[PDB]
């Protein structure tokens, strides 16, 4: 049974993710990047070098997410092809949910808290690169307004990964059971951690579906950039993840 599940997931989250909400919030509340000169100090065109920078972060985060997943009880017991399917389809949903933690209305943290890049500077890049961050800010503002802490987030991120309807899953039954356990423990956790917020659970569930759509739109913009910008390759790990996605 699942009396130790929340503890394991939360501990795995704290151990594996270099950035968390407590760290991000006390740094926010860093070298400012607000123009091209500041970009170069913190650092072969501009927009293309920012695009490349997001990939690096993604690659690192996936690296962290892989370790976090292996520590989710029952996950390492799955077929290696099922573990690939899950991370492949959950990873970007997890990235943007965790990315909310480093974002305010004015910008976001970069280079491990050492940097801050402004929302306005990002909005002011040449099309279509100016379209990359803004929807994430949009999502983050509403998500951050739910006032979740890392313990809630660990369980939320685990549920994103152990998802029984990812395409091409072999053992759907076991993974549905894994998910059932996590969602259950998450429901209980939110009730005791956020007693005044009656609808928090259903609100998170809504965020899960919002993230799916956010990722779908993001993959589309990434594909547009890939095919139409000459200086815009994708890291081979990211290319694996995006392959066959639609």
């Amino acid at each position: 049974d699942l009396k130790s599940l929340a503890k394991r997931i939360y501990e795995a989250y704290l151990k594996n993710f270099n950035m968390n909400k407590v760290k991000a919030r006390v740094i926010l509340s860093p070298f400012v990047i607000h123009d091209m000169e500041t970009l170069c100090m913190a650092e072969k065109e501009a927009e293309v070098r920012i695009f490349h920078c997001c990939q690096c972060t993604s690659v690192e985060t996936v690296t962290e997410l892989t370790e976090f997943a292996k520590a989710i009880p029952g996950f390492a017991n799955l077929d290696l092809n099922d573990q690939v399917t899950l991370l492949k389809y959950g990873v970007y949903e997890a990235i943007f949910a965790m990315l909310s933690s480093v974002m305010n209305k004015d910008g976001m943290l970069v280079a491990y808290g050492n940097g801050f890049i402004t929302r306005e500077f990002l909005k002011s890049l040449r099309k279509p690169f100016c379209d990359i961050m803004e929807p994430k800010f949009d999502f983050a503002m509403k998500f951050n307004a739910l006032e979740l802490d890392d313990s809630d987030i660990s369980l939320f991120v685990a549920a994103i990964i152990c998802c029984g309807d990812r395409p091409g899953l072999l053992n759907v039954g076991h993974i549905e059971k894994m998910q059932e356990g996590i969602v259950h423990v998450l429901r209980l956790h939110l009730q005791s951690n956020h007693p005044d917020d009656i609808f928090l659970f259903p609100k998170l569930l809504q965020k899960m579906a919002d993230l799916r759509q956010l990722v779908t739109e993001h993959a589309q913009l990434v594909q547009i950039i890939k095919k139409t910008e000459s200086d815009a390759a994708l890291h081979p790990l990211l290319q694996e993840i995006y392959r066959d996605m639609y």
């Binding site: 996936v62 690296t63 892989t66 290696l80 690939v84 492949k88 790990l237 694996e240 993840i241």
Partner: peptide, 8 residues
């Protein structure tokens, strides 16, 4: 999925 498999 060579690299994700590699991490896994």
């Amino acid at each position: 999925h060579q690299l994700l498999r590699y991490l896994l």
